[PDB]
Design a protein around this nucleic acid. Sequence first.
RNA 1: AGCGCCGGCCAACUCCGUGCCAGCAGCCGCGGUAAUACGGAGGGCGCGAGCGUUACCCGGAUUCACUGGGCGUAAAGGGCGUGUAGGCGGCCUGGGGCGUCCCAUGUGAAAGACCACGGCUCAACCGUGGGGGAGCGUGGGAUACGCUCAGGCUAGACGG
RNA 2: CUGGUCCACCCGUGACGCUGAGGCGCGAAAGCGUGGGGAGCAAACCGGAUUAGAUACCCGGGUAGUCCACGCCCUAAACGAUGCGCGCUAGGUCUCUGGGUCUCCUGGGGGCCGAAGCUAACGCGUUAAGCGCGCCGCCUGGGGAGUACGGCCGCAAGGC
Lengths: 148, 231, 137, 208
Amino acid sequence: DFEEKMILIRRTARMQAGGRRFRFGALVVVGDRQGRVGLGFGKAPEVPLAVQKAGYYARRNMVEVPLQNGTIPHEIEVEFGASKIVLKPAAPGTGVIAGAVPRAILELAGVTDILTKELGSRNPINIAYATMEALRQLRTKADVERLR
Amino acid sequence: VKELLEAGVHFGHERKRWNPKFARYIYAERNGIHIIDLQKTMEELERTFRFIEDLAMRGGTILFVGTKKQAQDIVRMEAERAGMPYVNQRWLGGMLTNFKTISQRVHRLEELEALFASPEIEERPKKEQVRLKHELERLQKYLSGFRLLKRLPDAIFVVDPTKEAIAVREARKLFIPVIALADTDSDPDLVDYIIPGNDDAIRSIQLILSRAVDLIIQARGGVVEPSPSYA
Amino acid sequence: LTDPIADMLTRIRNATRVYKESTDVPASRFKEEILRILAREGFIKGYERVDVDGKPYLRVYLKYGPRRQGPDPRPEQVIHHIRRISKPGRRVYVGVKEIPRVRRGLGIAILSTSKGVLTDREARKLGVGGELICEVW
Amino acid sequence: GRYIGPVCRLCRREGVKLYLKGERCYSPKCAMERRPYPPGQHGQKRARRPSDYAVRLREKQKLRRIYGISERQFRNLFEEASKKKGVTGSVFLGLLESRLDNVVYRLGFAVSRRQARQLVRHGHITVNGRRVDLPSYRVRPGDEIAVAEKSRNLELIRQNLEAMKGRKVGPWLSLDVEGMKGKFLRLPDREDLALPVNEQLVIEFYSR
RNA sequence: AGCGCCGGCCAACUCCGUGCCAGCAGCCGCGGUAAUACGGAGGGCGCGAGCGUUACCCGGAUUCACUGGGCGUAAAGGGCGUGUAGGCGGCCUGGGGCGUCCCAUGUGAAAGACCACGGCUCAACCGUGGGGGAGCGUGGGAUACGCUCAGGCUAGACGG
RNA sequence: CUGGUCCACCCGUGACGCUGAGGCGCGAAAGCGUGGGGAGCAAACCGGAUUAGAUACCCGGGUAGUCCACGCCCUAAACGAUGCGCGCUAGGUCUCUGGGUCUCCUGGGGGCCGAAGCUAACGCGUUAAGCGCGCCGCCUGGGGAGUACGGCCGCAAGGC
Ligand code: SF4
Ligand SMILES: [Mg+2]
Ligand SMILES: [Mg+2]
Ligand SMILES: [Mg+2]
Ligand SMILES: [Mg+2]
Ligand SMILES: [Mg+2]
Ligand SMILES: [Mg+2]
Ligand SMILES: [Mg+2]
Ligand SMILES: [Mg+2]
Ligand SMILES: [Mg+2]
Ligand SMILES: [Mg+2]
Ligand SMILES: [Mg+2]
Ligand SMILES: [Mg+2]
Ligand SMILES: [Mg+2]
Ligand SMILES: [Mg+2]
Ligand SMILES: [Mg+2]
Ligand SMILES: [Mg+2]
Ligand SMILES: [Mg+2]
Ligand SMILES: [Mg+2]
Ligand SMILES: [Mg+2]
Ligand SMILES: [Mg+2]
Ligand SMILES: [Mg+2]
Ligand SMILES: [Mg+2]
Ligand SMILES: [Mg+2]
Ligand SMILES: [Mg+2]
Ligand SMILES: [Mg+2]
Ligand SMILES: [Mg+2]
Ligand SMILES: [Mg+2]
Ligand SMILES: [Mg+2]
Ligand SMILES: [Mg+2]
Ligand SMILES: [Mg+2]
Ligand SMILES: [Mg+2]
Ligand SMILES: [Mg+2]
Ligand SMILES: [Mg+2]
Ligand SMILES: [Mg+2]
Ligand SMILES: [Mg+2]
Ligand SMILES: [Mg+2]
Ligand SMILES: [Mg+2]
Ligand SMILES: [Mg+2]
Ligand SMILES: [Mg+2]
Ligand SMILES: [Mg+2]
Ligand SMILES: [Mg+2]
Ligand SMILES: [Mg+2]
Ligand SMILES: [Mg+2]
Ligand SMILES: [Mg+2]
Ligand SMILES: [Mg+2]
Ligand SMILES: [Mg+2]
Ligand SMILES: [Mg+2]
Ligand SMILES: [Mg+2]
Ligand SMILES: [Mg+2]
Ligand SMILES: [Mg+2]
Ligand SMILES: [Mg+2]
Ligand SMILES: [Mg+2]
Ligand SMILES: [Mg+2]
Ligand SMILES: [Mg+2]
Ligand SMILES: [Mg+2]
Ligand SMILES: [Mg+2]
Ligand SMILES: [Mg+2]
Ligand SMILES: [Mg+2]
Ligand SMILES: [Mg+2]
Ligand SMILES: [Mg+2]
Ligand SMILES: [Mg+2]
Ligand SMILES: [Mg+2]
Ligand SMILES: [Mg+2]
Ligand SMILES: [Mg+2]
Ligand SMILES: [Mg+2]
Ligand SMILES: [Mg+2]
Ligand SMILES: [Mg+2]
Ligand SMILES: [Mg+2]
Ligand SMILES: [Mg+2]
Ligand SMILES: [Mg+2]
Ligand SMILES: [Mg+2]
Ligand SMILES: [Mg+2]
Ligand SMILES: [Mg+2]
Ligand SMILES: [Mg+2]
Ligand SMILES: [Mg+2]
């Protein structure tokens, strides 16, 4: 099993004659607090199905984040559309310093020490993905040498 | 197993309607046509077959796809011969990516073979017989080579990767490695184990797919002698 | 042409992003000294002085990672990132104590110093500073 | 000054017993034993999902409520920890611990930190000889924490000294009963205390 | 023992009264007879000899962007040329060493700040010690890039 | 009479280059001054219709003007709503104009479709809106307002 957090749940709507009709959107991150996180956004005619379906995709999309004493190996900046995420290495005491969105991802990934900043569009969805694709580009001292 | 005058069989084709990633597999261009270096085709047939072999000798499945009219029939022959699945007719969308749902249609196919072997009611109305049977032929047309697939292939073999881009797509999303014969209109990097050859001439579609099936049986348990080819 | 150096680095980035085996940049005993860092640190296979239409060039041999699994089989880059720091528009100079740590050590900053072209590591070693040519990782 | 009101509602709101009383804390007449739901008209109503903000406030209030300390004083310590070398969460708990009135309650001289205050405040306590009646004295390693000689002979302190005879006391402390004196051995490793506090969530409260 | 708050942001919910009125309000917005949003009440949350409001400064504001933004359609390319100042500038070789970089040395008061210790029962406050810095003067040194002088070249540019 | 520009030859010069605040020139139409010219057209204006009305649309008329010379004005959806130069990053098809060994190749233009990549999207994509360097111009919520004041230009209208 995995540990799960609901980052976002939103109602959307579409028009047709006679009225508007809703659908729900569930941004869920899921992880083991020991180097494995997954982000999934799930939509359905009702709330919990969406939260379920979210969690489903969440697993069907993971990433192996190279923790290091609970911090990430290096500075990293990523832009997903107009959203930007900054990740910066932090020493033992620091805590996770971030907004909920990139927090929820970093805690459930087992980060315990990091400095972050959102820049640009701070739409949670895009920020979510931007933080994921960020982690996904983390490299270790090894990773680099093997590569080169 | 490999043979060498496939030059008598194909040497490829297609004028500048080419994809340029396929540059490396081209010697020169002749009658206003791209001519495929056979020496490269060799280098590759080997490395491809090596992969094919390992898969047979571990008893692992191959999905055979070809629907361009030319490679159409020769996949019913060559794949049945290997006791392996194929899609001959239309390549339904989501066969790998939505396997369990597509297959939920094969249980229907079986279920008609069982129901329509006889009897368990022929006291069902005249129209329904007609109706149900019409359905039966239907599934049979597309799903015939598919039922042999009871699990996600351990690989897939494709005749035109360009033409069967959807197929290659579905595999890559699943990490199912892709084997294909591919003439100069194709994106090479998109294939894992690659056969740079004419993909439109049945001469060639024949040679390559057969010797494939041959290597499939020869390493699986047996050997066999000539199989069917239309003149 | 206003920045021979940037021009080079860009010729590389541009090539590396469509996965060319090599690309040639117009030769310079300074451009070379930078490639001599780029290869040594293992960012490129290396370079060789060639000629194109009678004119001196440096053919630069590019390096990447394995083929990959997934719908996008393109390999990771070895040069993920390379960009001018100092430029003709704004020369950028650092004393030794203020040489940046690129990417937590995993990348380098080539620098022209009066003890030749060095990396951060190398500079700090001989303990000198200089114009910060660029950054790679 | 400090909280000085109904103290059971605290535990009830925090959803956890904080041992803010001494004796009654351990009986089945404890509030949290009878009504382990939050104080007031609405405690029986079904809780709705606490916000991230909510959560960290609560954790901080809890850690704070334990020590009965004013919010300013709490804050000033936490900052002090953020300038102080090492892991802030540790040092914060450590510095919270090195307070006189806590050490006194730690070394068992009283049943409630509340009672352990009035003890220091009423000058019944001493450190290294000298009398000290400041509940906030930051106690260092080596310090001898006595009962006042003139206070040694008192009912309350007697009854409370008697309850300590073979009760073992944190790895960072020594207690010499009869001799009525104790010792501050070192600053507490985090493990050495086991409070219902994710002190991490506290750092996070103050980083907003 | 007081003061603010309990619609969302933001921690804290029920009853009555009122009925687009009286009123709240920092933004979104609340009130037209079942208002968690007005007023009172019970209850709750936050602080506590304080709590709140108003004003002003930095912050959040990567919203003047050096770090660290932009200009087809969101605000944003000059109507187009020509050209002064300026800014910027190809390959090779030497001299100079202005920028740049290194070392030494002077200066960089005291207080403050930072680390240690110590005195007022603690603290605030206060004392003793320690640690440096940019920056600028001076002496010495380096020469890759920028500069400058000098000599070559032909890939830029110009011409036949 | 005269400008731009492209090709081929690879003959000459030896970085003589890029951009460019100011400045200077050019700048559709309408408009303006003086003098011509005036067939067609046609603001203004007259009348007929349409219409609830119809200072319009439609119909019959009609003067500036439209045309020429000389001097002004200096605007614009003056648009690719895309500043200039250079270098680098797949190709496919149509086309204009050169030079070739004339199947085909190679330049310089004009279109479409598209690799990578970009982009909020729409779309851009060797004619970049891609990846980069140089310089210039410009944006910083909507209205108020391209208004006011001041200054400079203009015969005025008006422009900056
Ligand atoms: S623990 Fe002591 S303080 Fe908390 S409720 Fe039970 S009794 Fe009151
Ligand atoms: Mg990894
Ligand atoms: Mg975004
Ligand atoms: Mg962007
Ligand atoms: Mg570190
Ligand atoms: Mg926002
Ligand atoms: Mg084909
Ligand atoms: Mg910079
Ligand atoms: Mg306890
Ligand atoms: Mg949390
Ligand atoms: Mg600290
Ligand atoms: Mg305890
Ligand atoms: Mg802060
Ligand atoms: Mg308040
Ligand atoms: Mg608050
Ligand atoms: Mg709340
Ligand atoms: Mg009233
Ligand atoms: Mg009411
Ligand atoms: Mg309110
Ligand atoms: Mg109320
Ligand atoms: Mg006070
Ligand atoms: Mg402000
Ligand atoms: Mg903030
Ligand atoms: Mg700022
Ligand atoms: Mg900037
Ligand atoms: Mg902006
Ligand atoms: Mg323009
Ligand atoms: Mg103008
Ligand atoms: Mg000049
Ligand atoms: Mg100059
Ligand atoms: Mg130069
Ligand atoms: Mg000098
Ligand atoms: Mg100094
Ligand atoms: Mg000083
Ligand atoms: Mg300092
Ligand atoms: Mg002291
Ligand atoms: Mg001092
Ligand atoms: Mg020199
Ligand atoms: Mg010269
Ligand atoms: Mg030339
Ligand atoms: Mg010549
Ligand atoms: Mg110019
Ligand atoms: Mg000008
Ligand atoms: Mg004009
Ligand atoms: Mg005119
Ligand atoms: Mg006119
Ligand atoms: Mg007039
Ligand atoms: Mg006139
Ligand atoms: Mg006239
Ligand atoms: Mg009329
Ligand atoms: Mg009329
Ligand atoms: Mg009329
Ligand atoms: Mg008319
Ligand atoms: Mg007329
Ligand atoms: Mg007339
Ligand atoms: Mg007139
Ligand atoms: Mg136009
Ligand atoms: Mg143009
Ligand atoms: Mg404009
Ligand atoms: Mg605009
Ligand atoms: Mg310009
Ligand atoms: Mg620009
Ligand atoms: Mg031509
Ligand atoms: Mg010709
Ligand atoms: Mg033109
Ligand atoms: Mg063209
Ligand atoms: Mg297009
Ligand atoms: Mg694409
Ligand atoms: Mg093209
Ligand atoms: Mg754009
Ligand atoms: Mg405004
Ligand atoms: Mg305003
Ligand atoms: Mg005006
Ligand atoms: Mg105007
Ligand atoms: Mg005026
Ligand atoms: Mg203008």
